[PDB]
Design a protein around this ligand. Sequence first.
Ligand code: CLA
Ligand code: CLA
Ligand code: CLA
Ligand code: CLA
Ligand code: CLA
Ligand SMILES: CC1=C(/C=C/C(C)=C/C=C/C(C)=C/C=C/C=C(C)/C=C/C=C(C)/C=C/C2=C(C)CCCC2(C)C)C(C)(C)CCC1
Ligand SMILES: CC1=C(/C=C/C(C)=C/C=C/C(C)=C/C=C/C=C(C)/C=C/C=C(C)/C=C/C2=C(C)CCCC2(C)C)C(C)(C)CCC1
Ligand SMILES: CC1=C(C/C=C(\C)CCC[C@H](C)CCC[C@H](C)CCCC(C)C)C(=O)c2ccccc2C1=O
Ligand code: SF4
Ligand code: SF4
Lengths: 61, 74, 739, 148, 160, 130, 80
Amino acid sequence: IQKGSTVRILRKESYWYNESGTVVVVDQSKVRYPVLVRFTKVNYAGTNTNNFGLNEVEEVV
Amino acid sequence: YTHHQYIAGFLMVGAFAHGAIFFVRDYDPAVNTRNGEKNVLARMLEHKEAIISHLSWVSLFLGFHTLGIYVHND
Amino acid sequence: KSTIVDFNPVETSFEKWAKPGQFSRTLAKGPKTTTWIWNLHADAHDFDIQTNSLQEVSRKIFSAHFGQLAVIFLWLSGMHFHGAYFSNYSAWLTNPTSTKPSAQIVWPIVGQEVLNADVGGNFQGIQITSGFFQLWRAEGITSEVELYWTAVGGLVASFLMLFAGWFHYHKAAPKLEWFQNVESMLNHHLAGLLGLGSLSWAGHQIHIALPINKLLDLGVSPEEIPLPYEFILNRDLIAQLYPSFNKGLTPFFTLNWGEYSDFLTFKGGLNPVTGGLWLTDTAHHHLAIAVLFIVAGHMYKTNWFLGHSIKTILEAHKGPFTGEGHKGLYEVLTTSWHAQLAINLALFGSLSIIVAHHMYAMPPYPYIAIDYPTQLSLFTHHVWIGGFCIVGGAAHGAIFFVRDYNAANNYNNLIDRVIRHRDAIISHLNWVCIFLGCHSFGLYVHNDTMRALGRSQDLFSDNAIALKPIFAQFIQNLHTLAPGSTAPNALTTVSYAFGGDVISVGSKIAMMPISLGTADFLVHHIHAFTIHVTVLILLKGVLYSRNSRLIPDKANLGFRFPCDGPGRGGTCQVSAWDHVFLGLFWMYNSISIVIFHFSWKMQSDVWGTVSPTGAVSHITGGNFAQSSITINGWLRDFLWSQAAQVVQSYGSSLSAYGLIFLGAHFIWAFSLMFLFSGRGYWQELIESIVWAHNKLKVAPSIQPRALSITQGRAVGVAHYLLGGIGTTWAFFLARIISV
Amino acid sequence: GDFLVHHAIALGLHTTTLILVKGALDARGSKLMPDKKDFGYSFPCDGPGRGGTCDISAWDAFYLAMFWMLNTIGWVTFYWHWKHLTLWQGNQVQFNESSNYIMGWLRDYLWLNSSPLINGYNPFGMNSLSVWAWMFLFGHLVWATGFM
Amino acid sequence: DIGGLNPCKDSEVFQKRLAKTVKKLENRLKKYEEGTPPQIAIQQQITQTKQRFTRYADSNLLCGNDGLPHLITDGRWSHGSEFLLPSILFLYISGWIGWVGRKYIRTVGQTSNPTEKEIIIDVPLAISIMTSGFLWPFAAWQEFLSGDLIASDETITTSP
Amino acid sequence: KLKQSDFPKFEGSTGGWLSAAKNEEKYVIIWTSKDASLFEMPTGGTAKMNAGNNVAYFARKEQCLALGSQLRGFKITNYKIFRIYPPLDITLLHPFDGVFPEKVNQGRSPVGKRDASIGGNPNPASLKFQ
Amino acid sequence: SHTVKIYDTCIGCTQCVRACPTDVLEMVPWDGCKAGQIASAPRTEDCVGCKRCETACPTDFLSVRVYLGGETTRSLGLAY
Ligand code: CLA
Ligand code: CLA
Ligand code: CLA
Ligand code: CLA
Ligand code: CLA
Ligand SMILES: CC1=C(/C=C/C(C)=C/C=C/C(C)=C/C=C/C=C(C)/C=C/C=C(C)/C=C/C2=C(C)CCCC2(C)C)C(C)(C)CCC1
Ligand SMILES: CC1=C(/C=C/C(C)=C/C=C/C(C)=C/C=C/C=C(C)/C=C/C=C(C)/C=C/C2=C(C)CCCC2(C)C)C(C)(C)CCC1
Ligand SMILES: CC1=C(C/C=C(\C)CCC[C@H](C)CCC[C@H](C)CCCC(C)C)C(=O)c2ccccc2C1=O
Ligand code: SF4
Ligand code: SF4
């Protein structure tokens, strides 16, 4: 995955679970949740972006 | 008749409340799942949205039309 | 480049009409959830958060006032047009005591033409309880052409006010200094508006209403009554009815004002022909009011070395118990629109309630006292408006405290000292509310349980333990003795409610001494208790709007917020808005009890018919004295008994009242869904509904969200008020029109 | 009238079932609270955040469904009692005609048959039904205190 | 006949209802004068009442013991104009409404600002979609066949 | 006029502490101000600062912290909040390590940190009878 | 006293700490995020349960979680 890639959220406790988002940036450092994904639908708190782990996102073909 | 019907409603609400309590504090997904596949009870939480949506549809259908006919007669 | 206005401040364009939410910084970005739609209407008139300049807020308020006055003028024009075209006003003029006023006919669709009642005068339509016919008769309007011309003038005036609002927002908007001339504004509103309006109305009454109504009462038919302009061009048509116009204005300018006693009287009582106040008394009243208000308008210093400065008056009113006194109040009331709105709305609602009382107490229109539906509707409507306006004044006082209150500018003044001992005020008001409720209501419950136990001598009744309102009876005695003793130039008491003779017009009672017994004691203390509890809720909201022991920084959360969280044991409804919500509920309770007391007492002990020999028979038969002292009595002899006409209205011309009765019950019960439930359940149900929509690929882009907590409360209270007030509306109207 | 009231009963049953089933299935979590099981069956809320979470627990679903159960049982018992009052009095034509519209219920069941009850004690006397009128008023008072 | 009911053309209580309503209307008519608009309105009411009763009598309508038309909605085509034909009409109209709404939602859902086009409707596109709903039964059973009517697993689900 | 010279020029309000902050605990906030600014008390109304040492007593930690948050608007930062038990048992509370909690300071260990997201919490049925 | 837990989804944006009305949360060094900081809850005895901390949390389903528990005069917000 990279910037601009489309991924499916696999985190169950997510307002965008099973949904598709756009990767903003994948951090190359040793952070726990490097993948930053932007969504079109705001969550219940109003935010439309979140940091996800490498195993919590699945790239769409 | 009134006493027994009120007791009936109370008992039904209690049954559903204790089902909810079982879900909260006694339900174990691991026991009700074998190799990814889910048993008859665990599958009720998979189409839970379907169940709730169709209960909502039936309730709205009946309410809309019963009230409509009653108000039309009124 | 005028010193009072700014020229062409805002361009007249439709571009912002196509951008909803442009006023708000947060809503301008566009909707993402359905909460945006509701926030759009909740912030439309909150001009404080739309601009950071007091000048812009003031200009918006000024133009909004113009729009509101245009709407009011359009409403009045519609009323006059309906009177001119869809009314039986001409027939009602010739038979005021036997024709019911109707000014709205119903189209014949879906069988609704049954609503066109037999109002009399060869007319079919809805009976009118707004009293416009009596008002028009008091104005001297004897033809429907005059109603049409008044409607045309109302339309022209409404367009003029619309143009004025547009002009003063887009072409010449006044500056802040112009708005802050409170001395000049008070001078003008007191002299010009109030005094000159009273003077102009006195002139109209004297020259048009006095002769035309005197001819009408003499039996002259409206067709042979001269046109109103002929009473001005001919000093002989009015000098025959009032033989004092023959002297002209010479007695006025020679200080010989005694000559004008023909048409400027001081009589009191009611006109025996029409049952209303003497229009000569009304004209004299308006003249005196005009002079008093014009004099009162020359008080505040505006542009000369003459008059008062409100700042100097307030700052001089200090005291040992009040510290700095009223210092800083002038700055508060000249820099905060919310404080002015609070004061004006509170006094305006109180004035509306006072108007409601004085209306039925002293009927000011011809043939309005014998139109019981009109009297009941006018009283109930004005009391409801007064209660709503009072709650609004409390709400805007709380809003001022949250938003526009500056602690530095109010050091040790009255506002500061009130906040410093808010605990004492609220605790003592709590004790008073408990005392009053315990006593009034528990005396009611004691009466109920003594009656249920077969102990009739243990009640708080007249034939039992008696609580005579001696103080009110003393006042009643003082007023009935006033003519000739304390008001030596009066011929009759101000109102026959205080005592005197039974005034009947066409065998129908207009006014009669309202006896006060133990039943009135209990209901009056119920009124006091309900008013005190409403004041408690609203004052607790205003005083604890900024901080408390629970939330020391409640002002940082704003005026309108649902809570601070489930902590501290639970911090629901701590806002100040949530206090205007509960206070709205309690105002509904208080006003409902007030109007119930009025309806039952009038029907049982004032209204009715008078036999030719002088025997008085009332609508219900005096059951108020003995059966209004128990809650079962109120349930049975008032609610159950007088609800008979509403439930038996089906198939008749009052069936619309039964339908509205049922619909208002439905709406009131609907409110309880929002009042009793919470947002989380509805959001989680919307989750499954959204799942179904997504399964069918029909999920809207604007994400559907359950109504916010504050909006849920607002919807609940609005539906509750609408349902309750509509139920009482249908009940009252059907009952008082049937009988 | 039986048809319409049976459909009203079905609506009441379905709505009570909807509330209870929604609370039971959503007890372990939802989108607004995907960890609701960690807070137990009965908790006040999750706070004003995320738009507001009033009555989000499963206990609150029971609490809301109690009103609907009371309403449904009220409809059932109203129907039964009015049908049997008309059957016993003999005026079964009163039910068959007036039971098709709401005002028929309000006027001919409640308003009509409440006359003996409210006259259990009047400013003139009392009957053995006086205790029932007192209980009537007591129930109204407790109902409105619940409203408080 | 069906359910113990009888045709309203032979129901005495039906004619009694008609006669009582007409008598009440005529008694109301008596208290007005000449050819004045109130009398014209009451006469129109009488004429409409008579026409409605006559049409209900000659309508294959079954009346009970109260003299009111009862609806036979068990499904038989004999009384098919009471429920079945209005049922088909409503199903057509409501399917039209739902189809045009869904088509508009899916059409503006693929534009740059889907949420803007929901508070500010694209009236040209809205008119284009709305008049295309007359084929909603055919369009629905041409999109369901292609799998374009139902989502499969991109739909979101809660934690349990 | 007042018991101590460092008290803010407050006229006293019936919203201060009660018998609880005489036998359970009371909270004192101290700060130094350059100007005798007029500020709003967390309990009642308007008080006047001292051009120097200022000391205020409250019944809750939240009241002292609300006052401190208000002080930040006056460019006052050196405010410090203490807890006093029934006797003179003073404990510094708010600037616990001299650095405000919003700024990271070395020497702080994570308390209440779980090395997983919310979804990793154990099922309640496995946490029965412990 | 209530229980406050911090989860490694913390991005160290400090909005929770500066929203706590009773000084319960603080920022401590960390190496699991870009900011190099994580929220901590070392003074939960002062936690009141107002949940302002998690109203300011930007992470998807929160990184600070407040579990209401036993009540205390501090946690009940009792000035008396
Ligand atoms: C045989 C049936 C049965 C049994 C064994 C239980 C057992 C239990 N239930 Mg349960 N329940 C039942 C029926 C039953 N319930 C029914 C029928 C309902 C629907 C109304 C419920 C609704 C329900 C809920 C919503 C909850 C429970 C809970 C519980 C558990 C704790 C109970 C508790 O703390 O009591 C506490 C007892 C009281 C608070 C006393 C209440 C008394 C009420 C108010 C009536 C008293 C007023 C009285 C009529 C006065 C008359 C007034 C006068 C003027 C006329 C326990 C395992 C709780 C739990 O945590 O489960 C794990 C819980 O949250 N139940
Ligand atoms: C004698 C002069 C005079 C008169 C009659 C009025 C009358 C009024 N003013 Mg006003 N005002 C005046 C002087 C005057 N003002 C001065 C000198 C100032 C500057 C301090 C203001 C500042 C001011 C503000 C800021 C506001 C008012 C408002 C109002 C209205 C109150 C609403 C009401 O009671 O409805 C009664 C309504 C009527 C009786 C309808 C007929 C009234 C018409 C419009 C005559 C208005 C007189 C007007 C000043 C003449 C100017 C004409 C123009 C070509 C120059 C009322 C129309 C309020 C309002 O509603 O705004 C529109 C409001 O917000 N006034
Ligand atoms: C002179 C009268 C007056 C004026 C100028 C204002 C002005 C204001 N009020 Mg206010 N208020 C008033 C009277 C007034 N109020 C009264 C009498 C009450 C007591 C009920 C209140 C209670 C109140 C509260 C509680 C709040 C305000 C707020 C506000 C501000 C924003 C208003 C807004 O955007 O609403 C836009 C308009 C609407 C949203 C309209 C809503 C529709 C209403 C609720 C229903 C009306 C139904 C109608 C009768 C028809 C029903 C018939 C049915 C059959 C259909 C604004 C400064 C709010 C604020 O933030 O202030 C800063 C706020 O929170 N006011
Ligand atoms: C019928 C229902 C009902 C009743 C009885 C009350 C009663 C009361 N409300 Mg109210 N309230 C109601 C509905 C009701 N409310 C609703 C629906 C709402 C929602 C908006 C509110 C919202 C509300 C607010 C927001 C406030 C109140 C307040 C008050 C209190 C005013 C002080 C008073 O009179 O106390 C005296 C008590 C009574 C009159 C009740 C009856 C007591 C009897 C007659 C005498 C004593 C009986 C005796 C002790 C019995 C002993 C025997 C027993 C042990 C067996 C009082 C307790 C205010 C408050 O806190 O008090 C100051 C207040 O601020 N209420
Ligand atoms: C117009 C598009 C549209 C479509 C195709 C559907 C389709 C559906 N809805 Mg639905 N809904 C819509 C709009 C729509 N809805 C709107 C606008 C609302 C807000 C009031 C809802 C609220 C709603 C609820 C609360 C529920 C459904 C449910 C359902 C499902 C069962 C059918 C039902 O109960 O109808 C429900 C229909 C209504 C309650 C009335 C809808 C209001 C109008 C008629 C629709 C709006 C028309 C729109 C403005 C047209 C604009 C298009 C144009 C610009 C081209 C089905 C998937 C139920 C479900 O999940 O069952 C599986 C359910 O419980 N819907
Ligand atoms: C018609 C007929 C018949 C048949 C009958 C039948 C077949 C019936 C059935 C019936 C039925 C079939 C019923 C049922 C019901 C059910 C119910 C009522 C249920 C409920 C449920 C619940 C309450 C749940 C709970 C829970 C939950 C929530 C979850 C968890 C678990 C539990 C389980 C706890 C016969 C042949 C005999 C004869 C006559 C005719
Ligand atoms: C009903 C109505 C209307 C109408 C109104 C009107 C018509 C009014 C009028 C008004 C008027 C018509 C007024 C007038 C006024 C006047 C005046 C106010 C005057 C005054 C004067 C004076 C004050 C003088 C004094 C003097 C001098 C200065 C010198 C010499 C001496 C003397 C003392 C004489 C409209 C349509 C709008 C709307 C609806 C309602
Ligand atoms: C039902 C309900 C909702 C859901 C209600 C919603 C989503 C409102 C939906 C309104 C629709 C979409 C528009 C209005 C449709 C009406 C037919 C229009 C009004 C009727 C006119 C005559 C005015 C809440 O969000 C809520 C929040 C807090 C406490 C209680 C409740 C609550 O009870
Ligand atoms: S949600 Fe309802 S309950 Fe939970 S905090 Fe906000 S208000 Fe109090
Ligand atoms: S509740 Fe949330 S906000 Fe209030 S203190 Fe405990 S953590 Fe800080």
